[PDB]
Amino acid sequence: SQLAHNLTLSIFDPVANYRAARIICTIGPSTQSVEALKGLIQSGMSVARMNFSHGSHEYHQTTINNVRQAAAELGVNIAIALDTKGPEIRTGQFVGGDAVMERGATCYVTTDPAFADKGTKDKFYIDYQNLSKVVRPGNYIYIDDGILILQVQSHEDEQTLECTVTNSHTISDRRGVNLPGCDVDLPAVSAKDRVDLQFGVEQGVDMIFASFIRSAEQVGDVRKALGPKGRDIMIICKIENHQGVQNIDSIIEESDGIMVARGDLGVEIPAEKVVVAQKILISKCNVAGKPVICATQMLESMTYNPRPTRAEVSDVANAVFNGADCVMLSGETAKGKYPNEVVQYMARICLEAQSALNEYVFFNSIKKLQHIPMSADEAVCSSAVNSVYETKAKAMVVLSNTGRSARLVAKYRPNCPIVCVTTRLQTCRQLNITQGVESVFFDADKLGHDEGKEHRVAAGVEFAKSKGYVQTGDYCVVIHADGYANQTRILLVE
Amino acid sequence: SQLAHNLTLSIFDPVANYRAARIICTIGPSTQSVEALKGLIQSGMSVARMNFSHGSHEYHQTTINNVRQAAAELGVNIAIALDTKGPEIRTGQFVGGDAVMERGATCYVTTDPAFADKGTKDKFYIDYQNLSKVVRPGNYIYIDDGILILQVQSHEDEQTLECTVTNSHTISDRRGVNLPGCDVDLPAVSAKDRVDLQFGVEQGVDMIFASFIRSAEQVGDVRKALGPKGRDIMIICKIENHQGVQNIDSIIEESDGIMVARGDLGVEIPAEKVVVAQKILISKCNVAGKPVICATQMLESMTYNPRPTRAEVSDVANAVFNGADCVMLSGETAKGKYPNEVVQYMARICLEAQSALNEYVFFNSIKKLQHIPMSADEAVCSSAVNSVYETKAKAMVVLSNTGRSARLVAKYRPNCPIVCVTTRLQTCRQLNITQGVESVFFDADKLGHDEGKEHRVAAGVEFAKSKGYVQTGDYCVVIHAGYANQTRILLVE
Amino acid sequence: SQLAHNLTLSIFDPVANYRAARIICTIGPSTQSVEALKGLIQSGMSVARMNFSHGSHEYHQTTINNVRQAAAELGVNIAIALDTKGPVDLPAVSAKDRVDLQFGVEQGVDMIFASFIRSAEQVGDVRKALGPKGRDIMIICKIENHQGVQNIDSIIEESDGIMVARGDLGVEIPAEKVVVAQKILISKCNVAGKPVICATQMLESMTYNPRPTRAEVSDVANAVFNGADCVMLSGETAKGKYPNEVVQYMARICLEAQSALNEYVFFNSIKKLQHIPMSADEAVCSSAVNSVYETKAKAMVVLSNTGRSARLVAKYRPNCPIVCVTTRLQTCRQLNITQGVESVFFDADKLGHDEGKEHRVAAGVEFAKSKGYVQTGDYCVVIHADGYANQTRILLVE
Amino acid sequence: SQLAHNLTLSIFDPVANYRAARIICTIGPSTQSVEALKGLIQSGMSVARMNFSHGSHEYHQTTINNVRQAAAELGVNIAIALDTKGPLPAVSAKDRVDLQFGVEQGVDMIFASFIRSAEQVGDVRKALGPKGRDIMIICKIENHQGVQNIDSIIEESDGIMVARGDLGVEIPAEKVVVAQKILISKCNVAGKPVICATQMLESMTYNPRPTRAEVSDVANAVFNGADCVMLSGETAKGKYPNEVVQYMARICLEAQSALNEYVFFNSIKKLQHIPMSADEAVCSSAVNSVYETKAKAMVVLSNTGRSARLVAKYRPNCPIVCVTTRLQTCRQLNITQGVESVFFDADKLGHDEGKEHRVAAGVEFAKSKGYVQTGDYCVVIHADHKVKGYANQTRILLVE
Ligand SMILES: O=S(=O)(O)c1ccc(/N=N/c2ccc(/N=N/c3c(O)c(S(=O)(=O)O)cc4cc(S(=O)(=O)O)ccc34)c(S(=O)(=O)O)c2)cc1
Ligand SMILES: O=S(=O)(O)c1ccc(/N=N/c2ccc(/N=N/c3c(O)c(S(=O)(=O)O)cc4cc(S(=O)(=O)O)ccc34)c(S(=O)(=O)O)c2)cc1
Ligand SMILES: O=S(=O)(O)c1ccc(/N=N/c2ccc(/N=N/c3c(O)c(S(=O)(=O)O)cc4cc(S(=O)(=O)O)ccc34)c(S(=O)(=O)O)c2)cc1
Ligand SMILES: O=S(=O)(O)c1ccc(/N=N/c2ccc(/N=N/c3c(O)c(S(=O)(=O)O)cc4cc(S(=O)(=O)O)ccc34)c(S(=O)(=O)O)c2)cc1
Ligand SMILES: O=S(=O)(O)c1ccc(/N=N\c2ccc(/N=N/c3c(O)c(S(=O)(=O)O)cc4cc(S(=O)(=O)O)ccc34)c(S(=O)(=O)O)c2)cc1
Ligand SMILES: O=C1c2ccccc2C(=O)c2c(Nc3ccccc3)cc(S(=O)(=O)O)cc21
Ligand SMILES: [K+]
Ligand SMILES: [K+]
Ligand SMILES: [K+]
Ligand SMILES: [K+]
Ligand SMILES: [K+]
Ligand SMILES: [K+]
Ligand SMILES: [K+]
Ligand SMILES: [K+]
Asked: Closest Cα partner for C41 from C254, C296, C336?
């Protein structure tokens, strides 16, 4: 148990010889150059994130090219992620470019396009056309990152709502508006999204961080927007509101993974409930065997300060204790002052947290939830990880072309590194969001199809030796899984 | 498991009708009046903390008097805690009340008392007389809450050390110094502590927060300092350095509880390791069945702002998930702008976290660690909590005079409230640092000795009904526990 | 596990100081006399069986009278059982049965061995035949054919216990399926918490021989390993040449098997089958037996008037003796078909009602000291369970 | 648990399509002929026992010759066992002569009489010499000394025979029942064959039916966890040779339907020390996979039979099919419960280093017996000894 494991711990013991958790970095003005990216890779970046809320297709082209050049110069594989802007509810414009809202006052929000460029403190535009159909009297309208809170009183007509201003705040032009407790029915992908997703497929991005996902249906729309040529690209759904939290089971089932966007969730949902939401979403992904990213507000104060707050450190640590595959950095790397340091410290926190983490609790909890009889794939992978514990094996070798069984093995959480051997470079990149896994590329073009499998097994073991995980005498659990043929060997290392 | 419990959760389901975690508030200028204290009590204060690092005995007497008066008016029992100043290593004084230290410069730290008042940037005094004996070349000296970092180069003589100024910081008169990774051999109690602890006994405080506890022998020193008159006062040891972490096992055995002073630890130990240290100390206390306090840097930004940061909220919630009995507020309530609001919001976080917490994991882990054969006390209490889970009982009633068996039951973490019925008012107050327990005072002088135990059982069940824990048809596990013991699975009428 | 328990055993070790399984003897010409019954009791007889297939009411009246006299002279309580003659369509009770059962109620018998029970509806026929005056007499159903095996769940639910008649069953059912049937009926009675008797063909060849075959010895032992409350002797004590010797030998086989038997396997198996949430009665007894294992208690003390909670505790199988303190002598006699229990009579008319319960608990602990189960320093688990008032104490013996 | 398993049972339901326990028959005047031997085989004989307490070398030669001819005509493999006369020293002078005769004639196993200590096991081993290395030594436990030194005896031997009758001479019968539980369980942990012998269905030597007590005696031997049950005078000098073996098979099959294998599996798994060596881990993991996927058959590739015995130790709830390139392994596995052997002729078919053909042969056999059909799971396993670096392979195979 985790509690019993805590008793045996010492903060003066040397840390684990390997880091399981993965770090996602947002590329921007601070870190776009080849040299800056090489610093990021060496600091511990596994995935490069492109924020498509800003920048032209040419800015992100520079990022793509530079990421590829930096990784190739260091002989590593780095995943490229496209984070979409997504659909947005925003206000219109104001006369004088400004509107002062005072507590107690009455105002009118309208969806009539006439008021888009002449809004005042009394009446202004909101671009979400179905606003009146979704919102009822009693509901709240949040404006400007939820700083301004309006309470709906009644329908003035079909396009206008009577509202009370509950707090004093001054909103400028085109502020973002949130509708807490309301079922927003905006389309899955925006007009800009369809262009950006097309560009993603063309440039061969590894994964999509799909913004503002609310239902399972919308996951299908993002899939269709990618089309037949983008069928292999992973779709990671960003959960940003109550709808995504409510519909999570079906969302997970249709997606390739989940991002817990704490910041976005915090705007509509109380902070203490977001903490619990993080627990829920991470564990559901853990059982599903799909990557989960802890994102936004991670080491934020380290954007301009040389070190973060003690609370920020525990936040990162607990994301790992919760069971997250990945931890994300947004502005800390994008426009930050200490990009290498923040990644280096994040890696240090993850490594420290992993030393305190009793991996067996995860393994045992996930195995307990399996329905008997298990299918071949499930039984093989859980049994293989069980053999790691029972023989005290120091490494695992998984042969997986698509990375399917690699993620399935990683689900069961062994207390040793997992080495995936694959014939596809895309698999190497895409596994960078799966914890406890490292990828060896086996060039089937240059080295044959290895149908006997011995050459790939040898390539995996070789890597494990070079990294110092195993030596002569140690055990290493080798596993193959593709009418579904499979194999498991407990190998004695030469 | 916790992971399995997580899947069933919903952030839209109503929260628990009960909060297990206990809130400790520091009393200062923002909260010393009778009215302000009643505000705190209603907001969710269970323990009033007095910071004896600042203020006269007349000041803390007012706190004591105002707390008791506030509690009397609301008809509740509030614990009074004395937090000692403790022994300290400080720098001397500087000519012109100032010393600007520049990066790369050389300076000299001396233990020569003649330099106490005439120090400069090139040479100054540090009051720890055994500094040269403990510190070796290569070691670091932190000054002014760890902001100024000096590296020791050589012993200039038997009193003076040559040091390199590794970073630029200007320090004023009498700044606190830290010796990371060095065994500080200062006595357990200072001159001030000795006076202050005697005051605490005379005023009848319930518990002592003893600062800078480094070893088990030092707990005995605080024990001896309190004397025979204060033998029933709890000693909660504050872990602040590496010595406290290394000696934790022997300290816990000798103490009545532990405070995890994250901020103090953070000065000398890397933040990430302090996070892990918190896990170690809390779990160790949980197994020992002794109160553990998560203190310092809890909701610090809410001292001057109406709301805290998201990260601060998760810190408080995870303290509960770690298994802390208590969470503590310092400056937030002592000199803060939103004292009622921060206690209320901390209560909200604790209640929310508790709803997501799987107590059975705690119960099962602790039970698994018990050596068979168990003694009567351990067997009775673990069996009683196990009965709760197996019959889905909605409350527990424990008859405990000293609080001993009450603390032992709470150790096993049932998924229902515990109601302790005690004949001592001091037991009511002292149980305020034990999670998931509420105390009902039974006046033995006014209502008789009740050797049948039926009147005390009735009083406990009646309380559980009035709070809405149990109703007719619900099960309630009644337990009284040399060594006499008794367990009943009661059906509520 | 039993396998793990087997590893640590040694046949050369001194045997256990207490026997859990209970022996029932059939009374005939060889054992009817007062002196002969004194021999049976001392050899280890807990229950005397009357076979109403042979002999008149005056023959069985002598048996009843002599059993009571031999028991009183030795200062012990002995259960008297009435095994009916009995009569597939045939009625439950016959005309002779109804006449014989009325005689049983009048003479105050403790239990009925109802012959040839095939359905639960037939258990009710035996109930009516005993009438309102015999509502507290236990009905032990005798399974004799396939119908009894088929309807066993409903029969157990209605009966007060079961007897497995291997001989009768073996007439229509192959011997190898009877062995399995025995396993089934015993285990179901364990889960039900009702006594089960292993009867017929136990040590038959010891009727005229000084010692039985090895195969017969293993049959007695495996009955105890199956988890039977009672082992029964028919003609071995009724018409047999070595009555005292056969009871002494069966007692030795039971004592030996018990030493090899892992009680914890039984405790854990029955606890795992409990539907959560448990009710108060179920949770109190299982938790008390659990506390025995967790503290290594050397005895239990149960306060039970009807013998209900005494049986419920015995169900969960502690690895120590159970001492039941009861205010009624019929409970003492009726618990003689329950394994691992010993009864202590508490005279309420002579020593007060003891609503504080201290005197009954003290007498229980006293019996455990005199029998040498506990001494100063040992733990003893005390339990009372009658809106269902309950109590549990882990007591330190003075 | 066994108790929970009992509740769900019905005596009127169909029996198992497979028998785990194995039957050993003593050959005598009633059964020496080829015709009477063929009858014994079809009645369920797996091992033919020669009692060297009687008869000359020519008599047992006739037994050896006829057993092989009967088996060859029926197309099955039957083990030949040599039960020594015995005496004190371990082996007698006659034993040494007899053991040499057994080696020459190529017997499969020795039932070594009156074994009292571990030192004596090496004496039997020496009496077999270099050419008798591959012959199993099953130690007969006949007195208190054998019981006392059982741990060291099991460690040195290849198996144990519990001789109840002999033990009953000086030890009380009730303690022999307990002693039976001890030796059987100790062999189960060790994973070495154990035989329940003497006084099985004895009355059926001259009667057409045995007593009900004798039937429960046979059943409880299986419930204890015995690999084998042995017949002496019932098949040696008895009136009903075929009937007694058929009825013993009927009891063994009946007990198997009632027996819960998972209890055995869990008990032995719980007794394993962590960390396990690769071969022990692979074998228990493969059996665990059977339960968790509800596999209907196991296939073990084992030439020596070591991993077959190791897999059988953990008691899966399905047949074990062993594929071996040695006929002597086929014979020797006849004293291990729940295993059936398929001879893969390496000279005729090839050495099959890739193992694909032996796996196919194993599955084919399981299909032909009706253990598996299209859609079922079959657990294929191979596990070499430490000397070969624990070379191992496990497959969860979907049957076509
Ligand atoms: O004109 S009249 O002559 O009538 C007249 C009218 C009003 C007057 N007010 N006088 C006072 C005196 C003290 C005082 N608080 N002081 C402290 C303090 O504030 C803080 S802190 O900042 O919260 O941390 C930490 C302290 C640590 C120590 S120490 O460690 O024991 O040394 C000692 C003191 C303080 C305040 S106030 O409450 O701060 O306003 C007001 C005086 C004269
Ligand atoms: O993560 S948390 O901290 O919250 C947490 C939550 C729950 C936890 N519970 N873990 C357990 C413990 C025991 C257990 N049952 N085992 C047995 C069993 O099941 C059966 S049965 O026949 O198959 O019924 C027969 C047995 C016979 C014996 S023996 O007679 O001594 O050999 C011994 C054992 C069992 C089970 S479970 O019921 O099997 O799932 C689960 C632990 C931690
Ligand atoms: O009668 S037979 O002989 O055939 C027989 C048949 C079945 C038998 N199985 N017995 C068991 C089964 C499970 C088991 N698990 N313990 C758990 C555990 O250890 C951990 S932890 O992570 O390590 O702390 C977390 C758990 C979380 C959950 S859940 O998530 O709440 O479900 C549940 C359990 C555990 C144990 S035992 O407690 O280890 O003894 C014993 C035994 C005998
Ligand atoms: O002609 S030349 O003169 O040059 C010439 C060339 C090669 C020669 N080698 N022939 C051999 C010898 C051994 C051998 N494997 N034996 C073992 C074994 O197989 C297994 S296992 O359980 O089945 O895995 C378990 C063992 C346990 C022990 S022990 O426990 O330590 O006693 C000891 C041995 C084995 C093999 S094989 O091919 O691996 O079968 C082939 C001989 C002569
Ligand atoms: O929170 S956020 O950080 O996102 C944020 C949000 C709102 C902000 N408010 N005003 C801003 C700020 C920056 C900004 N562009 N700076 C750019 C830049 O610095 C560099 S460079 O690499 O450093 O030389 C390359 C760029 C390439 C393109 S592209 O040609 O269109 O691709 C576009 C811009 C930049 C613009 S603007 O409208 O683009 O002129 C407007 C500022 C930041
Ligand atoms: O298991 C074997 C064994 C076990 C215990 C003692 C001795 C042997 C043994 O000698 C032997 C063997 N020897 C051999 C064969 C042919 C020629 C010379 C020697 C060949 C095989 S094979 O399975 O690889 O055929 C298996 C064994
Ligand atoms: K975005
Ligand atoms: K957004
Ligand atoms: K301090
Ligand atoms: K809860
Ligand atoms: K009868
Ligand atoms: K025992
Ligand atoms: K002999
Ligand atoms: K079976």
From this structure: C336
Give the helix/strand (H/E) hosting C5: helix C2-7
For residues C301 and C291, what is the distance between their CA atoms, to the nearest angstrom?
13
How was this structure determined? It was done by: X-ray
Question: Given 3.40.1380.20, 3.90.980.10, 3.40.50.300, 1.10.510.10, which CATH number is that of D1-19+256-400?
Answer: 3.40.1380.20
Q: Please give the residue of chain C at the shortest CA–CA distance from D200.
A: C215
* CATH of region C1-19+258-398, choose from 3.40.50.300, 3.40.50.720, 3.20.20.70, 3.40.1380.20: 3.40.1380.20
> Using an 8 Å Cβ cutoff, are A125 and A115 in contact?
yes
Any A CB within 8 A of D271 CB = no
A131, A150 contact by CB (below 8 A): no
Right CATH number for A1-18+354-493 from 1.25.40.10, 3.40.50.80, 3.40.1380.20, 3.90.1200.10? Answer: 3.40.1380.20
Spatial distance between the Cα atoms of A447 and A274, rounded to a whole number of angstroms: 50
Write down the CATH number for the domain with range A19-86+188-353: 3.20.20.60
List residues near ligand 2 (CB under 6 A).
B 1, 360-361, 364-365; C 1, 264-265, 268, 272; D 1, 4
Q: What's phi and psi for A172, nearest 5 deg? A: -90, -165
Residue A444: CA atoms inside 13 Å, Cβ hemisphere, count? Answer: 11
d(CA B403, CA B425): 11
At A388, list the tokens: 């790691």
Residues β-bridged to residue B476:
B395, B490
The domain A87-187: what is its CATH number? Answer: 2.40.33.10
Which of C26, C181, C55 is closest to C113 using CA atoms?
Answer: C26
Final resolution, Å: 2.7
Tell which residue, C243, C232, C235, has the closest CA to residue C195.
C232
Regarding the domain delimited by D20-86+90-255, which CATH topology (the fold level of the hierarchy) does it fall under? TIM Barrel (3.20.20)
Give, for B378, the enclosing helix (H) or strand (E). Answer: helix B376-391
Please answer whether residues A210 and A86 qualify as being in contact, where contact means their C-beta atoms are separated by less than 8 angstroms: yes
DSSP 8-class letter at B94:
B
What whole-number distance in Å separates Cα of residue A290 and Cα of residue C5?
Answer: 45
- In single-letter form, the type of residue at position A414 comes to P
Q: What is the CA(D317)–ligand 14 centre distance, in A? A: 6
HEC states along chain A? CHHHHHHCCCCCCCCCCCCCCEEEEECCCCCCCHHHHHHHHHHCEEEEEEECCCCCCCHHHHHHHHHHHHHHHHCCCCEEEEECCCCCCEECCEHHHEEEECCCCEEEEECCHHHHHCECCCEEEECCCCHHHHCCCCCEEEECCCCEEEEEEEECCCCEEEEEECCCEEEECCCEEECCCCCCCCCCCCHHHHHHHHHHHHHCCCEEEECCCCCHHHHHHHHHHHCHHHCCCEEEEEECCHHHHHCHHHHHHHCCEEEEEHHHHHCCCCHHHHHHHHHHHHHHHHHHCCCEEEECCCCHHHHCCCCCCHHHHHHHHHHHHHCCCEEEECHHHHCCCCHHHHHHHHHHHHHHHHHHCCHHHHHHHHHHCCCCCCCHHHHHHHHHHHHHHHHCCCEEEEECCCCHHHHHHHHCCCCCCEEEEECCHHHHHHHHHCCCEEEEECCHHHHCCCCCCHHHHHHHHHHHHHCCCCCCCCEEEEEEECCCCEEEEEEECC
- Residue A48 Cα to ligand 8 midpoint, Å, equals 18
**Which residues in C lie closer than 8 A to residue D165 (C-beta atoms)?**
214
- Is the distance from CB of B365 to CB of B332 less than 8 angstroms? no
Neighbours of chain B (3+ CB pairs under 8 A): A, C
Q: Count CB neighbours of D336 within 10 A.
A: 26
